[PDB]
Amino acid sequence: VPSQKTYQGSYGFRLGFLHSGTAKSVTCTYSPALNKMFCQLAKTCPVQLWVDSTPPPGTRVRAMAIYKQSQHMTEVVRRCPHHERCSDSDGLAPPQHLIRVEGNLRVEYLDDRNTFRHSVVVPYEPPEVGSDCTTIHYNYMCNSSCMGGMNRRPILTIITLEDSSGNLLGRNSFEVRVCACPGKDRRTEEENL
Ligand SMILES: [Zn+2]
């Protein structure tokens, strides 16, 4: 099981998210109270990278999904049979991968030879000078309710910064639910508190 321990490391690495609210029409919205992203299938999910100092050139940013519940965590998170066979390739992503990056031609996908886990990595780009974070646009390509995939089990996304040889520089994580009405579901889940 890949580690999910938060680690800001030397560059002060944190994640940020847009403060999108819960109107019925939002496509992606983040709950700080739950540390949980609610988003729609194949829609843009912005995730911000914030650092206190700039990691060096050749730094990379990897995203991987794991099941949140200890009893499912050893199982590889992948797309259901249906979505795996759907005609929705962007030509870069492997069809079994849950997490894609959109709008980045340098994107690299990995099937880990030993663990069988999937992940997606992009070069780290600094923020524009006087803009304060780097944004990556993720797409989640199955719903949390897909039969034969996640099947309503909750998942985490783990975001790592790594150097050009794959050494760990920083790690954060957040829970994700991929669903039809992220605003409504966020509001409903927050009602429990
Ligand atoms: Zn699916």
Numbering used by the authors: 97 to 289
Can I see the authors' text?
The p53 tumor suppressor protein is a central regulator of cell proliferation, DNA repair, differentiation, and death. Structurally, the p53 protein comprises constitutes an intrinsically disordered N-terminal transactivation domain (TAD), a folded core domain or DNA binding domain (DBD), and a C-terminal oligomerization domain (OD). In its folded form, the DBD exhibits a β-sandwich topology with two loops and a loop-sheet-helix motif. The structural zinc(II) ion is coordinated by four amino acid residues, namely C176, H179 (in loop L2) and C238, C242 (in loop L3), ensuring the correct folding of the DBD through the stabilization of these two loops.
Herein, the structure model of the recombinant human mutant p53R280K DBD (without the four stabilizing mutations described in Reference) was obtained by X-ray crystallography for the first time. Crystals grew in space group P21, which contains four molecules in the asymmetric unit and each molecule comprises amino acid residues 97 to 290. The overall fold of the p53R280K structure is similar to structure of the wt p53 DBD in the absence of DNA. As observed in wt p53 and in some mutant p53 forms, in mutant p53R280K, the L2 and L3 loops are stabilized by a zinc(II) ion, which is tetrahedrally-coordinated to C176, H179, C238, and C242. Additionally, at 2.0 Å resolution, it was also possible to confirm the mutation of p53R280K DBD at position 280, as the density for K280 was clear in all four molecules present in the asymmetric unit. This K280 is located at the H2 helix, which belongs to the loop-sheet-helix motif of the DNA binding surface. In the wt DNA-bound p53, the R280 residue is directly involved in DNA recognition, in addition to interacting with a structural water molecule. In the DNA-bound wt p53 structure, the guanidinium group of R280 forms two hydrogen bonds with a guanine nucleotide of consensus DNA, while K280 (in p53R280K) would only be capable of forming one hydrogen bond with DNA. Superposition of both monomer structures clearly shows that the distance between K280 (from p53R280K) and the DNA molecule is longer, a consequence of the shorter side chain of lysine compared to arginine, as also observed in other contact mutants p53R273H and p53R273C. Due to the increased distance and weaker binding, p53R280K is unable to form stabilizing interactions with DNA, which consequently causes its loss of function, despite other well-established contacts that could be maintained.
